């Protein structure tokens, strides 16, 4: 019994890009949600299926923590029943999502003068990503009917595109650190409660 790992997810030095999103499993710890409250910095605290004021009286078998870095003007895509470049190729949440998603600002924690081109996202994909799936590939997208082998030219494009975060940049186009805590419940007995 110890305080849960919700101290490094929100305070890590390096954050993951959208396509290669890192996932943490949290189990066998006493839930300490007090850090989320009275923070005055979380610019988006939305919960789906469970209220945020009733988090301390609920039993959760497994808690999954997922972390991305997306553009400010597309945080709204992270929700059940939403469509877009992110919610259809990069990340996906099922229509019965049971968790809380949080996102704050990192205007000067990830941005550097001249542009931090580290963060990338999927721009081309054939189909719709299945929920809670991470498809990672470098295979070059074939837009036309002619098979393409390795070369990059017409009708043959790279799947990943980099962001352009900068110091003097608009609020909607500024980087955001977004965390998802899916409070999934399993038919197996709830080993951990509270």
């Amino acid at each position: 019994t110890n305080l849960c790992p919700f101290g490094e997810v929100f305070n890590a030095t390096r954050f993951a890009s959208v396509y290669a999103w890192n996932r943490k499993r949290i189990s066998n710890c006493v839930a300490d949600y007090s850090v989320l409250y009275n923070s005055a910095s979380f610019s988006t605290f939305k919960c789906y299926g469970v209220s945020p004021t009733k988090l301390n009286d609920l039993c959760f078998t497994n808690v999954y923590a997922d972390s991305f870095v997306i553009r400010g003007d597309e945080v709204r895509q992270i929700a059940p029943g939403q469509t877009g470049k992110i919610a259809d190729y990069n990340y996906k949440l099922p229509d019965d999502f049971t968790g809380c998603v949080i996102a704050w600002n990192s205007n000067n924690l990830d941005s550097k003068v001249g542009g931090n081109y580290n963060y990338r996202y999927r721009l081309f994909r054939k189909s719709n990503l299945k929920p809670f799936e991470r498809d990672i590939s470098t295979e070059i997208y074939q837009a036309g009917s002619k098979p393409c082998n390795g070369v990059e030219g017409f009708n043959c494009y790279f799947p990943l595109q980099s962001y352009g975060f900068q110091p003097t940049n608009g609020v909607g186009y500024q980087p955001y650190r977004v965390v998802v805590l899916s409070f999934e419940l399993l038919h197996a007995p709830a080993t951990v409660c509270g």
């Epitope: 007090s34 409250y37 009275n38 605290f45 939305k46 919960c47 789906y48 299926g49 469970v50 209220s51 945020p52 004021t53 009733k54 301390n56 609920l58 059940p80 029943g81 229509d95 019965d96 049971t98």
Partner: antibody, heavy 119, light 108 residues
Framework: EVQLVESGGGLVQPGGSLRLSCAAS????????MHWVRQTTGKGLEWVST???????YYPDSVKGRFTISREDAKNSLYLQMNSLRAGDTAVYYC??????????????WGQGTLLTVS | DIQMTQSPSSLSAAVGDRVTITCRAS??????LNWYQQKPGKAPKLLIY???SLQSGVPSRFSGSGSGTDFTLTISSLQPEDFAIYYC??????????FGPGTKVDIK
């Protein structure tokens, strides 16, 4: 028996401020969540703010920064502090009690409300 | 921003008739619906939560059914006291709960 007598309404100049309360009775006021719900002739019932059992506050996009909510366990009083009022703020404000059945959330008992008008 | 649509906006029936109003959702929100009844000028009250459970003290005439993005509230036999404006609200997305427009049930 749970009565929520809201008070503090009245004519107020634009950009002014008020401190309207909601007195309760008949139950413990430290184990339940408080919300503010307003009713307008135009957009109907809306959720304005809320306060929990651990000092957490939640405000809509428009409400954020302007209005603040507060609790007082000793005197059984729930407050709403309003700053920089706008013209389109006239409504009847109801304080509601939040109750739960597992994962579902609902409002069980409601007050009477006060008329608030900005002139 | 979750839009909520209710129809019809007006429904008149004689005493003892069967009254049915419909609640529709912008997106699939499961079974997180709550009903309300508001006498003219008085305090609104909760009738049915989660679209299937009866509140602790409510006339047995009211009943609820529906799932997904369409929900229905049923009244068996109308009584003169059941003239009010009804509301339906979702509890799936929190803390920004959004209500419907409301339905005024007139008595002829």
């Amino acid at each position: 028996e749970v009565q929520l007598v809201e008070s503090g309404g009245g004519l107020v100049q634009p950009g002014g401020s008020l401190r309207l309360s909601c007195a309760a009775s008949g139950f413990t006021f430290s184990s339940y969540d408080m919300h503010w719900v307003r009713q307008t002739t135009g957009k109907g019932l809306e959720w304005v703010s809320t306060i929990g059992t651990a000092g957490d506050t939640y405000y809509p996009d428009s409400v954020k920064g302007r209005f603040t909510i507060s609790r007082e366990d000793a005197k059984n009083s729930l407050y709403l502090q309003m700053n920089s009022l706008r013209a389109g703020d006239t409504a009847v404000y109801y304080c509601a009690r939040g109750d739960s059945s597992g994962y579902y959330y609902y409002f069980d008992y409601w007050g009477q409300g006060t008329l608030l008008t900005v002139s | 921003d979750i839009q909520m649509t209710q129809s019809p906006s007006s429904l008149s029936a004689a005493v003892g008739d069967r009254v049915t109003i419909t609640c529709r959702a912008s997106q699939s929100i499961g079974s997180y619906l709550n009903w309300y009844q508001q006498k003219p000028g008085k305090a609104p009250k909760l009738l049915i939560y989660a679209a299937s459970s009866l509140q602790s003290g409510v006339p047995s005439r009211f009943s609820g059914s529906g799932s997904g993005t369409d929900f229905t509230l049923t009244i068996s036999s109308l009584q003169p006291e059941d003239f009010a404006i009804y509301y339906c609200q979702q509890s799936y997305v929190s803390p920004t709960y959004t209500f419907g427009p409301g339905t005024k049930v007139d008595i002829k």
